[PDB]
Design a protein around this ligand. Structure first.
Ligand SMILES: CC(=O)CC(=O)SCCNC(=O)CCNC(=O)[C@H](O)C(C)(C)COP(=O)(O)OP(=O)(O)OC[C@H]1O[C@@H](n2cnc3c(N)ncnc32)[C@H](O)[C@@H]1OP(=O)(O)O
Ligand SMILES: CC(=O)CC(=O)SCCNC(=O)CCNC(=O)[C@H](O)C(C)(C)COP(=O)(O)OP(=O)(O)OC[C@H]1O[C@@H](n2cnc3c(N)ncnc32)[C@H](O)[C@@H]1OP(=O)(O)O
Ligand SMILES: NC(=O)c1ccc[n+]([C@@H]2O[C@H](COP(=O)([O-])OP(=O)(O)OC[C@H]3O[C@@H](n4cnc5c(N)ncnc54)[C@H](O)[C@@H]3O)[C@@H](O)[C@H]2O)c1
Ligand SMILES: NC(=O)c1ccc[n+]([C@@H]2O[C@H](COP(=O)([O-])OP(=O)(O)OC[C@H]3O[C@@H](n4cnc5c(N)ncnc54)[C@H](O)[C@@H]3O)[C@@H](O)[C@H]2O)c1
Lengths: 291, 291
């Protein structure tokens, strides 16, 4: 019954940064890891900006409390360029790097050698099979999926995915951790896309196909879903928000898995944007242009 | 260039009652038509409850002005079980009856004979082809789709569907009417499901399939979509809200016109509930039970 206190977050992008922020904000000792010092410095800057927005609203009537919250949370987030140098004394690894099985397996296979014996490994993968990543290590009993939603400081859901090998002890530690982060964990089977993505992604692809067919504009489709279905974001706004590169990798993976399935037919428009390095908000342009 | 003032609504169910309510609340004279006097009484009763709520929240600090508002709105709503006589002179007929092509065509073919020449005909159909229903009359230039969203008193979207035969004047009158109702019109092509349903319905069916596959409970799927995607309602709650009978009709229709398309594959669970007359909130029970 290990109580997660030290968390190593690998990847400081859209999700990793958010996971580190919330873990640190809730009293956990955090080490954020990424490829270079510049990337980490940028992630840190992003987290600070996010924290201040949280502070302006959560501590609107107490600026000092706001200052202390921002400072305390940031000081709880250490940074390192090599996770292997950190894991020998961490309680939990939360991987949030590129959505690519080979790269994730290579990462975990290496960390498995450096991590303390009690260290739990968790992947924030959007569409890959947890069992496949777990077998890249010899620590399957302490391996599971811990899937957060974008943006992490706001979305309450956390899908907890056990593989047939995950131990009850590992599962309960992750459920307890989820609640410690102030989230609402939902245990899910290790099936492609788990719950949310399995239903959300195919829908987003259909939105793109409707647009490519020339049936309607991206603008009207977004307006229609927000005003007709009550969605916070139209599909194209959400696609850019999630990241077009990540979306493409998700669908390519499933497509390869089930080539004839209409749900996973690649989109020429999506592939072209990704090929042109227009990944959405994270690059300043996706289906739409941003600042 | 007709300005819609007198409106005839055929069908006093979930959508018809809502359309009558908003048109009347915005100053139009309305005649709500249905099959029996008991159905109309229930429809008008429901509109009153919706108004009592629209009042307590729009005339909270002014109780008396609230009652006057409710009374005056209900008064501007006449009822009748004889559409043929009512349409002799009306500016617009908005049909909101059972989602069944044959039944809708039979209705409009007949009314086309009793309505004044300037009268515009519009269908609130969820998934049928406007061109198909229009050709059941000889008033195609004055026929179009006017699709509202559930609940009508809340959802701002209205899809305005032109057929290749709809005149610009008819289109404009419907756009003006939509805005008069305080709605946000979006012109859509006459493609199956237009924008919202083409994307929404297949998603609702996928949610059912995930449940039927035994991968997750309806409760967790709803929790996951709300907490992970920020949706107002989980798919199962929305299905019951929309009506399981209507959902089934929509899908069976698309299935018939494209039997080899796996996306329109009917659901055994959905058919069973409909067969047992459990249509959701409508009947007090659908996937979930309601008090
Ligand atoms: C691909 C996978 O594997 C899994 C995935 O995650 S799929 C994608 C799942 N995520 C979604 O679908 C997101 C859908 N969109 C939404 O729910 C909302 O648009 C949203 C949560 C992103 C916020 O949008 P919004 O309503 O316009 O909020 P915004 O106007 O941006 O800010 C207002 C509120 O949001 C908060 N906020 C938004 N982004 C924030 C962030 N990054 N950090 C902290 N706070 C933030 C503010 O604190 C604020 O609080 P107040 O209301 O008190 O002012
Ligand atoms: C099949 C097709 O052809 C097309 C279709 O329509 S598909 C279905 C489209 N509709 C949707 O997707 C529904 C999605 N769900 C929603 O957007 C929301 O859940 C909802 C609008 C139904 C309301 O949800 P909610 O947040 O729980 O609100 P609720 O708690 O029910 O009531 C709160 C507000 O809604 C209003 N409201 C809800 N139902 C109402 C009604 N029938 N009449 C008047 N007001 C109502 C209240 O007046 C209230 O105002 P306040 O916030 O100021 O108090
Ligand atoms: N974008 C979303 O909405 C969403 C939500 C939940 C889960 N996910 C999943 O989370 C993961 C993270 O995606 P993201 O949106 O944050 O992407 P991102 O592109 O914003 O960030 C990824 C980060 O990973 C780093 N990285 C790449 N390879 C690495 C390696 N070998 N070692 C260390 N760091 C490495 C990159 O430098 C980058 O900062 C993916 O598996 C994705 O499918 C994303
Ligand atoms: N349920 C939704 O969320 C939604 C939203 C938009 C559009 N629609 C579409 O709107 C239509 C209305 O559906 P609904 O949810 O209000 O269903 P409903 O079952 O609640 O209401 C239909 C009403 O039609 C009446 N009716 C049937 N045949 C009639 C006839 N010949 N003359 C007069 N009245 C007749 C019924 O007595 C009933 O009161 C359908 O075509 C549906 O696809 C439904």
């Amino acid at each position: 019954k290990i109580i997660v206190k030290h968390v190593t977050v690998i990847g400081g992008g859209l999700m990793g940064a958010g996971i580190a922020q919330v873990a640190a904000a809730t009293g956990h000792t955090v080490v954020l890891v990424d490829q270079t010092e510049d990337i980490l410095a940028k992630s840190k800057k992003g987290i600070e900006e996010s924290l201040r927005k949280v502070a302006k609203k959560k501590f609107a009537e107490n600026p000092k409390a706001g200052d202390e919250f921002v400072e305390k949370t940031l000081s709880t987030i250490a940074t390192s360029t090599d996770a292997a140098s950190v894991v020998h004394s961490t309680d939990l690894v939360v991987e949030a790097i590129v959505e690519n099985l080979k790269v994730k397996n290579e990462l975990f296979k290496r960390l498995d050698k450096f991590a303390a014996e009690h260290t739990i490994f968790a992947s924030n993968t959007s569409s890959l099979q947890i069992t496949s990543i777990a077998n890249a290590t010899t620590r399957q009993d302490r391996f599971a999926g811990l899937h957060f939603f974008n943006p992490v400081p706001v979305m309450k859901l956390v899908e907890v995915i056990k593989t047939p090998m995950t131990s009850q002890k590992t599962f309960e530690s992750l459920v307890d951790f989820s609640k410690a982060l102030g989230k609402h964990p939902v245990s899910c089977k290790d099936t492609p896309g788990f719950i949310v993505n399995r239903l959300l992604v195919p829908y987003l692809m259909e939105a793109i196909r409707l647009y490519e067919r020339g049936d309607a504009s991206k603008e009207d489709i977004d307006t229609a879903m927000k005003l007709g279905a009550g969605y916070p974001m139209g599909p194209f706004e959400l696609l850019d928000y999630v990241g077009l590169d990540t979306t493409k990798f998700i669908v390519d993976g499933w497509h390869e898995m089930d080539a004839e399935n209409p749900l996973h037919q690649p989109s020429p428009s999506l592939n072209k944007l990704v090929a042109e390095n227009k990944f959405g908000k994270k690059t300043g342009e996706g289906f739409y242009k941003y600042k």
